[PDB]
Amino acid sequence: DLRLHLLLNTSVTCNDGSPAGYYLKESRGSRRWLLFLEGGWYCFNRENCDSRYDTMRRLMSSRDWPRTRTGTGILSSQPEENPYWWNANMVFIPYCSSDVWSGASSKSEKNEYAFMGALIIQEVVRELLGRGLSGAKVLLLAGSSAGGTGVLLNVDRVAEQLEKLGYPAIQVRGLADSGWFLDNKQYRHTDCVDTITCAPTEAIRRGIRYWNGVVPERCRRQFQEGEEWNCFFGYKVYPTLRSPVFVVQWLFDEAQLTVDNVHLPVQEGLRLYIQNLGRELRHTLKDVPASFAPACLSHEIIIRSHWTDVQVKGTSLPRALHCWDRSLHPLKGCPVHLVDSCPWPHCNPSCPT
């Protein structure tokens, strides 16, 4: 079990002003640290943030958080369930800022909600240095869904912060799970008139203004003011990063099909759309040396207990991550770039059921 610690700096808060926090399980015999970012969509205006506060309050507030949580998947401490990093120090950071981990704004007389996702990550790092993170050799910043996108937005700032605090020996790396999205054409098209019909590029554009969102500077300098929404899309922000990042992405991600207005007897027009989506995602990973991209229709995520079962070209994700570790000290029979090439959902027999 991982135990809850609320942040001692109570100015760093969830959406409703309650303090943010983290769940920790230490491993005294390890200099490896894994910091995982929870996901779960976002909100970008007053109407749909109020709605999220009614029926998804744990993603906006800490007042009902439990004292402990069980580590699963890559956060498990049993080698049977986690062949990769079972002996590492484990940290689970709840997602209570609804800003794709990008915000830096407090609740005030002009803001009903606080959006502090970027500052939450930095304060967790600062308070963990007193918990033994000061002795680390590798800090792996991982995340799923909106947390996977948050890895891409924040991994270089974490490396930046540890350098200016005087810890240059800590190697910072990233693992982005199911947060690599495309700003493609929708299958059926709707103008941004309400939350349902607003495409991701439009919603992110308004979110950044509503959140006071921040993006990596090198990406910020390419796209500049008014256009920072481009940095939320993995294939645009990844080439600007300096830290090593491993990318996990289904070729037919369910969240991607949702924002494309696809809801699954497939006729020709939809078949070509789905097949073209798989091609485009494969194409964006072509220059990504560390990646895992199975041809599955799925919403599953690397903290699930059976994450070891899926294979690409005969290699599992825990093995690919171990190969990545070795490559950061090409390897015989221990590959790191694993992208399916078959064109339809579940053509890989090991896809989740």
Look up residue 254 and give its two tokens: 């369910």
Q: 99 near 120, Cβ under 8 Å?
A: no
Tell me if residue 325 is catalytic: no
181 near ligand T1Z, rule: CB under 6 A: yes
Between CA 296 and CA 105 the distance in angstroms is 38
Assigned token pair, 339: 């992208």
287 labelled catalytic: no
Among positions 120, 140, 208, 259, the unique one binding ligand T1Z when judged by CB under 6 A: 259
* Subset of residues 194 to 253 that bind ligand T1Z, contact rule: CB under 6 A: 200, 204, 232-233
Binders of ligand NAG in range 122-141 (CB under 6 A): 123
User: Rounded to whole angstroms, how far apart are CA atoms 246 and 141?
Assistant: 10
Binding pattern for the stretch 37-56 against ligand T1Z, x by CB under 6 A and - elsewhere:
--xxxx--------------
Catalytic choice (97, 145, 298, 316): 145
Binding mask 78-117 for ligand T1Z (x = CB under 6 A): ----------------------x-----------------
What's the token pair of residue 236? 């645009």
Q: Do 123 and 68 form a contact (C-beta atoms < 8 A)?
A: no
User: Stretches 4-12, 81-89, 148-156, 269-277: which one binds ligand NAG (CB under 6 A)?
Assistant: 4-12
DSSP string of 137-166, one letter each residue: SEEEEEEETHHHHHHHHHHHHHHHHHHHTT
Q: Which amino acid is located at 15 in the chain?
A: N
Q: Which of 12, 100, 257, 262 binds ligand NAG (CB under 6 A)?
A: 12
Of 7-15, 36-44, 169-177, 252-260, which segment contacts ligand NAG by CB under 6 A? 7-15
> According to CB under 6 A, which residues from 11 to 40 bind ligand T1Z?
39-40
If DSSP codes are grouped into helix, strand and coil, which group holds residue 306? coil
Q: Which of 234, 30, 245 is CA-nearest to residue 132?
A: 30
Phi, psi of 209, deg, nearest 5: -70, -40
322 tagged catalytic = no
Choosing from 5, 299, 322, 346, which is the catalytic residue? 299
| Choices 13-21, 143-151, 266-274, 327-335 (CB under 6 A): range interacting with ligand T1Z | 143-151
**Is 312 in a helix, a strand, or coil?**
strand
DSSP string, 248-284: E--TEEHHHHHHTT------HHHHHHHHHHHHHHHHH
| Residues in touch with ligand T1Z (CB under 6 A) | 39-42, 100, 145-146, 149, 181, 200, 204, 232-233, 255, 259
| Residues in touch with ligand NAG (CB under 6 A) | 9, 11-12, 119, 123
Which positions are annotated as active-site residues?
145, 253, 299
